[PDB]
Each structure stands twice: as structure tokens, then as C-alpha cells.
């Protein structure tokens, strides 16, 4: 009996290559609370990211965000690897 996370990967503002920005991976509606979020560039873990506090909603689902400052550059693919309930899913930036 589990609720899989609804995940969004996005930037703080529209990507302009060479301009600093923020990459975020946001997960919500999940339970149990055990979860891992990893920011990837071309499949490699991005270092020195920040994890938010874990939010506890009234329906007993949770929310969590991982993010980092970065500077988008051409050719790169940004995504988030999300592990919940022993299953892993990769989520693309998309836009």
C-alpha cells in the first residue's frame, strides 16, 4: 500500500545557456516518507545540492525538494533520479 511520488523537474526561470539559474526536483503526494532525490547532469550526480525539509500533509503524504545553483550549458541533459519504495525513475527537465 503505497503512493508513488508525483515529480517535477524544473528551473527557477527559463533556461538561458551561460546564465546562472537553479535546478529543482520536487516530489509530492508520496508515502512512505523514505525517498531519494538525485540531480543529474548527463547522468552524473551533481555535487553540493540542497535538500529541503520534509513536509507532512494532512492526508499523511509528504513533500520534498532538492535543488542547486547551476549554469546551464549547451549539450547537457539535466534530470532527477527518484527512488521510492525500492523503485527508481528518471525525470527529465523538459522545457
From TrEMBL:
<feature type="domain" description="Ig-like">
    <location>
        <begin position="5"/>
        <end position="92"/>
    </location>
</feature>
<dbReference type="GO" id="GO:0005576">
    <property type="term" value="C:extracellular region"/>
</dbReference>
<dbReference type="GO" id="GO:0002474">
    <property type="term" value="P:antigen processing and presentation of peptide antigen via MHC class I"/>
</dbReference>
<comment type="similarity">
    <text>Belongs to the beta-2-microglobulin family.</text>
</comment>
<keyword id="KW-0393">Immunoglobulin domain</keyword>
<keyword id="KW-0391">Immunity</keyword>
<dbReference type="GO" id="GO:0042612">
    <property type="term" value="C:MHC class I protein complex"/>
</dbReference>
<keyword id="KW-0732">Signal</keyword>
<feature type="glycosylation site" description="N-linked (GlcNAc...) asparagine">
    <location>
        <position position="48"/>
    </location>
</feature>
<keyword id="KW-0490">MHC I</keyword>
<keyword id="KW-0964">Secreted</keyword>
<feature type="disulfide bond">
    <location>
        <begin position="25"/>
        <end position="80"/>
    </location>
</feature>
<protein>
    <recommendedName>
        <fullName>Beta-2-microglobulin</fullName>
    </recommendedName>
</protein>
Amino acid at each position: 500500500a503505497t503512493s508513488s511520488p508525483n515529480v517535477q523537474v524544473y528551473t527557477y526561470k527559463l533556461i538561458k545557456e551561460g546564465e546562472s539559474n537553479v535546478l529543482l526536483c520536487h516530489a509530492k503526494d508520496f508515502s512512505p516518507p523514505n525517498i531519494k532525490l538525485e540531480l543529474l547532469e548527463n547522468g552524473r550526480i551533481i555535487p553540493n545540492t540542497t535538500q529541503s525539509d520534509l513536509s507532512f500533509e494532512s492526508d499523511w503524504s509528504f513533500k520534498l525538494t532538492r535543488y542547486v545553483e547551476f549554469t546551464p550549458q549547451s549539450g547537457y541533459k539535466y534530470s532527477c533520479m527518484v527512488t521510492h519504495n525500492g523503485d527508481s525513475k528518471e525525470i527529465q527537465l523538459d522545457r
